[PDB]
Write a protein that binds this ligand. Structure first.
Ligand SMILES: CC(=O)N[C@@H]1[C@@H](O)[C@H](O[C@@H]2O[C@H](CO)[C@@H](O)[C@H](O)[C@H]2NC(C)=O)[C@@H](CO)O[C@H]1O
Ligand SMILES: [Cl-]
Length: 398
């Protein structure tokens, strides 16, 4: 009798990100192509002994939200953006990869109250529509990158329950959750937190690790198969794991990456920790020689430290490389594009996978077919003349 209404939630790296690098220019975004903007990131003043940002170490603001000068400046421009799209909803995202402070902020009644008061303050001062919590990750701590404890799982539920109670009705409360299967199994009580959340952003990307070639494949590749079971991920696999945990599809946004990654398999041996015979590890070996790593290093990508490549840089530096070193291909099973470069032998070497307009449209088709609530994307500053966001808007009828 009537058509569906989908979300398109665009993260924007405005203040800087540990993996994605310095923040970008908010004036370049087309805010008519999205329903929600997650401005990223607020940080958390914390007492973690390994914290290296001294501004977060101010003991008199422990557990409150830190906004850098650029973040404050961008947030003051929101009235201008709203004039271009009066329906736009703007949230502040607190956290991100490597962001400390959540475990301590969630731990006690007193600490949660300080954090919640700070959220309300930031929402009121900048006239925000709500708050997105991007904790990577409760319990696991991103494998020790941030402090964590097993009590984080129950403390996160209490923090969300108490924030939902404190926030004015009509303000939004959302979270991002990881692709790892252990997230719904061990880190986050998805069934217990669902009543408090307007929607949940699934980070269905960053899969190009271990023995897996693809960073954001919708389904598993067969031409370029992942070897170790513990590395075998796809956006669909992640969705099904969250559904099996008890989330309803309409509450979920499928995360879409406006970037690619050079797979770790290209430069580091891949280990299958479930191998019965340890003598058979590593099960994959690097296939980049110094020549290939030097190509990326000259473009500013040091593969010894990171593998993230913005989509607009894929277009300008790889697709349109003057020397024509990269050939684009389509993986019909994975439903995403990828690039190869030629080895000395003339053998094609899998260089990077990413998302193009075709693959974004196919992820929108999945959203519509599976009954998900919408799309989310990381991140708007990495789009190429707003083209991927525009494709999502067209495919979802935004
Ligand atoms: C399937 C899986 O769990 N892959 C892990 C990756 O998620 C992870 O990368 C990190 O993923 C976050 C999203 O969940 C990103 O916010 C973050 O930028 C990214 N970190 C880096 C350095 O790329 C990697 C890193 O530990 O491990 C995989 O196993
Ligand atoms: Cl392309």
């Amino acid at each position: 009798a009537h058509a569906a209404s989908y979300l398109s939630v665009g993260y924007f790296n405005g203040g800087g990100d540990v993996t994605a690098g310095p923040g970008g220019d908010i004036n370049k975004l087309d805010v008519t192509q999205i329903t929600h903007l997650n401005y990223s990131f607020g940080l958390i003043y914390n007492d973690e002994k390994q914290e290296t940002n001294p501004a977060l170490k101010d003991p008199s603001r422990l557990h409150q939200i830190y906004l850098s000068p650029k973040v404050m400046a961008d947030l003051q421009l929101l009235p201008v953006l709203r004039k271009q799209n009066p329906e736009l909803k703007v949230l502040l995202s607190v956290g991100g990869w490597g962001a400390r402070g959540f475990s301590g902020a969630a731990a006690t009644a007193e600490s949660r109250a300080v954090f919640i008061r700070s959220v309300q303050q930031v929402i009121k001062q900048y006239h925000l529509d709500g708050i997105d919590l991007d904790w990577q990750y409760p319990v696991n701590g991103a494998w020790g990158l941030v402090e964590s404890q097993p009590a984080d799982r129950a403390n996160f539920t209490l923090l969300l329950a108490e924030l939902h109670k404190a926030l004015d009705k009509g303000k939004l409360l959302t979270i991002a959750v990881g692709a790892n299967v252990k997230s719904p199994q061990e880190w986050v009580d998805v069934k217990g937190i669902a009543p408090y959340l307007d929607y949940i952003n699934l980070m269905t990307y960053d899969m190009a690790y271990g023995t897996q070639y693809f960073n954001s494949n919708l389904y598993d590749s067969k031409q370029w198969p992942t070897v170790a079971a513990a590395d075998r991920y796809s956006a669909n696999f992640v969705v099904d794991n969250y559904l099996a945990a008890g989330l309803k599809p309409a509450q979920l946004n499928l995360g879409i990456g406006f970037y690619g990654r050079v797979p770790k398999r290209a430069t580091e041996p891949g280990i299958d920790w479930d191998k019965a015979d340890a003598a058979k590890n590593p099960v994959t070996q690097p296939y980049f020689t110094a020549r290939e790593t030097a190509v990326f290093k000259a473009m500013g990508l040091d593969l010894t430290k990171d593998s993230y490549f913005k989509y607009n840089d894929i277009v300008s530096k790889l697709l349109n490389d003057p020397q024509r070193r990269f050939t684009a291909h389509w993986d019909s099973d994975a439903q995403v594009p990828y690039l190869t470069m030629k080895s000395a032998e003339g053998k094609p070497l899998f260089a990077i996978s990413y998302e193009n307009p075709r693959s974004v449209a196919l992820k929108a088709d999945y959203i519509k077919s599976k009954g998900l609530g919408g799309a989310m994307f990381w991140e708007y500053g990495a789009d190429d003349n707003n083209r991927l966001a525009h494709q999502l808007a067209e495919s979802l009828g935004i």
